[PDB]
Design a protein around this nucleic acid. Structure first.
Ligand SMILES: Nc1nc2c(ncn2[C@@H]2O[C@H](COP(=O)(O)OP(=O)(O)OP(=O)(O)O)[C@@H](O)[C@H]2O)c(=O)[nH]1
Ligand SMILES: [K+]
Ligand SMILES: [Mg+2]
Ligand SMILES: [Mg+2]
Ligand SMILES: [Mg+2]
Lengths: 182, 230, 150, 61, 504
RNA sequence: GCAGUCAAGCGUUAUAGCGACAUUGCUUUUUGAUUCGAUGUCGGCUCUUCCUAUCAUACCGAAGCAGAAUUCGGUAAGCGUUGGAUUGUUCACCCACUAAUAGGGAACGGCUGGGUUUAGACCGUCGUGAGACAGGUUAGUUUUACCCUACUGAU
């Protein structure tokens, strides 16, 4: 609690402007190959993680590319509005036979989905409001174990723990698992 | 009604008989109305009105200048055009911060008679593999809300800013004790991961770690801004 | 089905929405705080400012998002007609931008209330509150074109 | 074994987490062979954290 | 520097343990094999039994004897279908891994290769100065590897003698940046298209300018292509196709110094133009379309290909190497007569064009929608294949000189290798830490060189699909890279105002 | 917030240095998908008044405002602004009614629960110990008015 004001200076030095960490192409290749050959054992624990350029190491082949950013070519103003310059569809149909086949397929899929949601939702929630029926308020006892105080205690004990023991009930062990915490 | 029914109604029946005259007289009155608003509006509304008037006048002058200029009249490759974007540190001297400002006294006991615990009020970098000390032996407190892992680092060359992970704290200018505690204050020299910057040495080594200097107060603005020392 | 979508509330542009929400915070929350008051009172004052502004932005975004139809969920005739009229790609991209902005505003509000828990003076708490409101305003300013389109 | 793996840490802490009424307090009392943590059949008996010293280098939370 | 983890005590003991010697068993039984052509899908000889100790050279001689070309053999590469090549011998290739047993059959896919080899470039010959601004484009002469043309941002081009690594000629006719340079496929004239919306022709031997500049484009030139020698009738000079930002492609007759055709179908800026080997022109533009024009029909657009959702940045043809090389080969021999030059150019082009039944000229377009499309414009109008997987825009695409591989260099700091016939994905080349600008094959389709934004060149081995050598030395971004016809030199240029020459 | 760009100005005869309005990058990327340490003061009951930075009610202005409903804004404080659930915590959150369930000051520069709760007791952590606390639980007497003034009524 000393009240003296220190003289905070940084001296000129050429050590500030040099590279601090470098990695060779051979080392990058070795670590890229090693990332992938690891066979994790359930009885091995991580004591200390090696410092590596994981952004350069986490390269995974992907079968598909992300969608093209349409805003670069066409803006909202040209898409729709007083200054809109769009007059034709971007991807016109091949022909009217393909168009009507696609529309018939869409009609069939829409009807199937409507039946599938009419099995549960329409016979459930939607029908109740017509008669003025509202479900009773959810009881506050069922939200126990979800308070900010309890979860602050949980993050405190996790931050203080080196080993964490998750305790499961042998009657319903999958029921009593905290997957989000894990 | 469907589609542009108001426009169709205007086309079929016209407008009110005095619409044009009423609109013309209102537009003639607008100058007196603007002057009266400027002299009558008070408080925040008046200040906002003055600010908007200044902005409109600036925009009008720019439009006039552009029209007059028009009326008077990097060596990139083909695939890159039509596309857009001393060993002194930049902050040799910063404000001194005393221990009284740095630390907050935390009292313990039922009657709050013990005062041996201290809390760091500044943002910190604790590193990898950090575990909290047991509460009985925990004198220095670095709360988790104030711990930082990344910073917005501006590169002097190429004029870009990238969100980079923090590797270490090299020198806190206030004190070596703050350096080893990991305090992030203005003028602190930190080490940052520059893997996505694509830096290569003259010998072919990929650079993924360099030094940066913190140029703001994260305790004040809730974020860490730094300049990369190239 | 629904067959009509005239009951969508008015979508303000970015600057007008900013003026509405910020001036609502200024009018509807208390505005006098003194440096001589307790630090807990000062912290509560600025926490209330941040939380109220975030809630206002979020409720405007939610009113936008609930009102507009789901282009994929409607009948195929309505879907094709609205795709012809409004360019479904731009339609969904604008609504998704609104959703992303809502999530970002919520995140900023939570982070800065947590940071304001540790404020040590009126100046620091005021700086944190202004930082939160400025970050929210930058998020909202990044929605100028989608709001006009919507 | 965990203590031996962290022999350079001078102490380790083991935090017990899980659903209410799963028996964390009972397990800690079992390890200490003494009722050091309050136990009840009703959920939510434990309300705050508690440190228990099992050995000189091992703490339970 | 970050080091790999060191070996442990147990690993050191394992190393000190005695090693096993990969020896060929003397009791190795015969294996039943069937040959099969990769290009044509044809089998030769059926099921034939071969000794287990057969070498690759002996197998090659046996296959030549089976085909009946023992007097003039052509070396082949063998693979077995996973598909694994034959490196040294059959036992060490297949039986030693144990995937295929001795009793089972071996289906050997054979593929023709090049007679010669190109050594990888391992070192920088020299850093030659002379350009006052950043280097924008470069190319090698087709007839010899001792001549390089390099156009830069100081409104000039330079002809460099690569034997002594010294400047030879300065070409200072243009007014603005020299955006693109090109050499005539007969090696007679250099064509430069500049930022001042002009084109100029230069005699290289005298370092001189032929006539006045070619004018008519209202925007800057984007790409230059030459008419192929095998289509040029003897006694006449090839025509020059030019694209530009204004969206028009102009055809120039250099004999009379005139403009014959001005194609204008593109609504936006034309990215590139290519003069194919079947009397067609392929144009790619920022209007997300590819236009196929017929030169023989008064420049009438035969087809419009519309499958991309962004700017098509580049396009390439399967026979591009033969089109650029004309009649010359890697030995640098010059035909005596124009008739002989046309005939030899026709033979060289046909070597890539007419194979496995019917001649085809495949095209690949790399666009800004992170993808590529593989087309066969003569037979079908729909795209034959779609190549996806790049996470950012594909800046460059190149067909291998034999046409059996495609290489795409993207802005996601990666290169991708795809099959040339069906377009399926093969491999990814990684090691660049900044965006890859452009790429170049070697003459025998075994080595590749790429230049990147991270100031480095990289040579990759296509067969092993790994990085062969890493070449630093550029102090700033590298914009252009090229490999000589004979496979002896590589040139690179960029922001450092230096021409780097690389050799073995 | 940091780093940069532009230039209405200011400065100058050395295109040095300041610099409004604007603007770019990071925070934060496109198909509306899916709780992390407040270290020292809190909440009620009864009852009055004030502010306006107006939630409702009154009157207006604008908007693709057809009608109905709604959004933004102006004058405006005359008049209203609720009943409940929840303490293994609520520096709040849900249900409903309602015209509406607006914000705040006069404290925070009388009854009553949290709390400064001293002597009894138990558990946990630390200490060789007397004991102290990272802590957790329970039990525990402060009791005017007839004085002046103010206020309400009465001679
Ligand atoms: N049969 C059986 N009962 C057990 C066992 N362990 C605990 N219990 C019972 O389960 C109940 C829960 O005990 P606790 O120790 O309080 O469980 P907890 O997880 O600590 O619960 P909370 O403290 O309320 O969060 C107690 O009544 C125990 O008697 C066990 O191993 N076997
Ligand atoms: K319990
Ligand atoms: Mg318990
Ligand atoms: Mg008012
Ligand atoms: Mg006591």
């Amino acid at each position: 609690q000393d009240s003296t004001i220190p003289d905070a200076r940084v001296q000129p030095d050429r050590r500030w402007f040099g590279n601090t960490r470098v990695i060779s192409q051979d080392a990058l290749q070795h670590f890229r190959s090693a990332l992938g050959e690891t066979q994790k054992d359930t009885y091995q624990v991580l004591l200390r993680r090696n410092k590596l350029p994981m952004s350069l190491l986490e390269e995974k082949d992907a079968d598909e590319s992300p969608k093209a950013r349409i805003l670069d070519t066409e803006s909202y103003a040209d898409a729709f509005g007083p200054k809109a310059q769009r007059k034709r569809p971007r991807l016109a149909a091949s022909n009217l036979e393909d168009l009507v086949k696609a529309t018939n397929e869409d009609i069939t899929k829409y009807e199937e989905k409507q039946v599938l949601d009419a099995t549960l939702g329409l016979m459930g929630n939607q029908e109740d409001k017509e008669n003025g029926w509202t479900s009773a308020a959810k009881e506050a006892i069922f939200s126990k174990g979800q308070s900010k105080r309890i979860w602050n205690e949980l993050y405190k004990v996790i931050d203080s723990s080196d080993v964490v023991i998750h305790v499961l009930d042998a009657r319903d062990p999958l029921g009593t698992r905290c997957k989000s915490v894990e | 009604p469907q589609n542009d029914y108001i426009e169709r109604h205007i086309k079929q029946h016209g407008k009110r008989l005095d619409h044009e005259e009423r609109k013309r007289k209102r537009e003639a009155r607008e100058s007196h109305k603007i002057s009266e608003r400027a002299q009558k509006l008070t408080g925040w509304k008046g200040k906002q009105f003055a600010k908007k008037r200044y902005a409109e006048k600036v925009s009008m002058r720019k439009k006039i200048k552009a029209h007059e200029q028009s009326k008077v009249k990097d060596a990139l490759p083909t695939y890159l055009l039509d596309r857009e974007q001393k060993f002194s540190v930049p902050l040799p001297k910063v404000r001194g911060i005393s221990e009284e400002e740095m630390f907050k006294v935390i009292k313990t006991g039922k009657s709050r008679s013990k005062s041996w615990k201290r809390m760091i009020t500044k943002h910190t970098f604790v590193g990898e593999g950090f575990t909290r000390r047991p509460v009985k032996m925990e004198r220095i407190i670095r709360p988790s809300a104030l711990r930082q892992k990344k910073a917005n680092v501006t590169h002097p060359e190429l004029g870009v800013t990238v969100f980079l992970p923090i590797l270490a704290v090299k020198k806190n200018p206030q004190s070596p004790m703050y350096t080893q505690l990991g305090v992030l204050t203005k003028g602190t020299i930190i080490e940052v991961n520059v893997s996505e910057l694509g830096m290569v040495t003259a010998g072919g080594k990929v650079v993924w770690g360099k030094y940066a200097q913190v140029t703001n107060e994260p305790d004040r603005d809730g974020c860490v801004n730094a300049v990369l020392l190239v | 089905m629904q067959l009509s979508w005239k009951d969508i509330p008015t979508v303000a542009p970015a600057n007008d929405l900013l003026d509405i929400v910020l001036n609502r915070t200024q009018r509807k929350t208390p505005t006098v705080i003194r440096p001589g008051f307790k630090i807990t009172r000062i912290r509560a004052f600025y926490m209330r400012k941040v939380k109220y502004t975030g809630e206002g932005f979020v409720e405007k975004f939610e009113d936008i998002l609930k009102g507009f139809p789901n282009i994929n969920d409607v009948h195929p005739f309505h879907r094709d007609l609205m795709d012809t009229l409004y360019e479904k790609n731009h339609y969904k991209i604008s609504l998704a931008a609104i959703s992303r902005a809502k999530s970002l505003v919520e995140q900023v509000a939570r982070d800065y209330v947590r940071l304001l828990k540790f404020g040590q003076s009126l100046f620091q708490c005021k700086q944190l509150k202004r930082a939160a409101l400025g970050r929210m305003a930058t998020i909202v300013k990044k929605l100028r074109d989608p709001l006009a389109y919507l | 074994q965990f203590s031996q793996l962290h022999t350079d840490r001078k102490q380790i802490s083991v935090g017990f987490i899980g659903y209410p009424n799963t028996g964390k307090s009972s397990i800690i009392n079992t390890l200490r062979k003494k009722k050091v943590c309050q136990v009840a059949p009703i959920p939510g008996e434990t309300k705050v954290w508690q440190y228990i010293t099992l050995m000189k280098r091992i703490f339970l939370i | 520097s970050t080091l790999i983890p060191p070996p442990s005590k147990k690993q050191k003991k394992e190393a000190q343990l005695p090693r096993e010697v990969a020896i060929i068993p003397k009791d190795l039984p015969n294996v039943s094999i069937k040959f099969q052509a990769l290009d044509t899908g044809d089998n030769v000889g059926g099921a034939l039994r071969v000794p287990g100790a057969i070498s690759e050279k002996q197998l090659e001689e046996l296959l030549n004897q089976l085909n009946g070309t023992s007097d003039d053999p052509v070396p082949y590469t063998f693979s077995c279908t996973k598909t694994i090549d034959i490196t040294d011998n059959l036992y060490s290739s297949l039986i030693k891994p144990g995937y295929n047993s001795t009793e089972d059959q071996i289906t050997l896919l054979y593929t023709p290769r090049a007679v010669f080899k190109v050594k990888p470039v391992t070192r920088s010959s020299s850093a030659i100065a002379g350009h006052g601004s950043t280097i924008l484009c470069s190319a090698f002469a087709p007839h010899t590897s001792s001549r390089m043309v390099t156009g830069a941002g100081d409104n000039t081009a330079r002809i460099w003698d690569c034997d002594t690594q010294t400047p030879m000629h300065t070409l200072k006719g243009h007014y603005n940046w020299v955006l693109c340079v090109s050499w005539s496929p007969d090696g007679e004239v250099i064509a430069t298209g500049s930022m001042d919306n002009t084109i100029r022709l230069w005699d290289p031997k005298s370092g001189q300018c032929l006539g006045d500049a070619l004018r008519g484009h209202s925007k800057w030139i984007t790409s230059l292509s030459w008419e192929p020698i095998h289509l040029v009738k003897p006694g006449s000079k090839p025509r020059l196709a030019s694209s530009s930002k204004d969206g028009t492609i102009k055809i120039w007759d250099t004999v009379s110094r005139v403009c014959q055709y001005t194609m204008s179908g593109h609504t936006n800026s034309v990215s590139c133009v290519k003069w194919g080997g079947q009397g067609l022109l392929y144009s790619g533009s920022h209007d997300r379309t590819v236009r196929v024009w017929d030169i023989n029909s008064q420049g009438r657009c035969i087809n419009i290909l519309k499958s991309h959702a962004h700017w098509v940045n580049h396009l390439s043809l399967s026979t591009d190497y033969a089109l650029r090389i004309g009649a010359f080969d890697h030995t640098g021999k010059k035909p005596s007569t124009p008739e002989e030059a046309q005939k030899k150019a026709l033979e060289n082009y046909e070597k890539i064009c007419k194979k496995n039944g019917n001649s085809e000229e495949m095209m690949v377009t790399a666009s800004d929608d992170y993808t590529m499309f593989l087309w066969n414009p003569l037979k079908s109008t729909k795209p034959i294949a779609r190549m996806t997987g790049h996470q950012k825009l594909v800046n460059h695409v190149a067909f291998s000189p034999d046409g059996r591989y495609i290489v795409s260099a993207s802005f996601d700091n990666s290169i991708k290798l795809w099959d040339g016939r069906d377009g399926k994905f093969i491999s990814t080349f990684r090691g660049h830490v900044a965006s890859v600008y452009q790429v170049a094959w070697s003459s025998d389709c075994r080595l590749l060189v790429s230049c990147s934004k991270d100031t480095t060149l990289k040579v990759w081995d296509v067969r092993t699909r790994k990085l062969s050598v890493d070449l630093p030395g550029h102090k700033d971004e590298v914009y252009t890279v090229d490999w000589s016809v004979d496979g002896k030199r590589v040139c690179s240029g960029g922001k450092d105002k230096m021409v780097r020459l690389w050799t073995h």
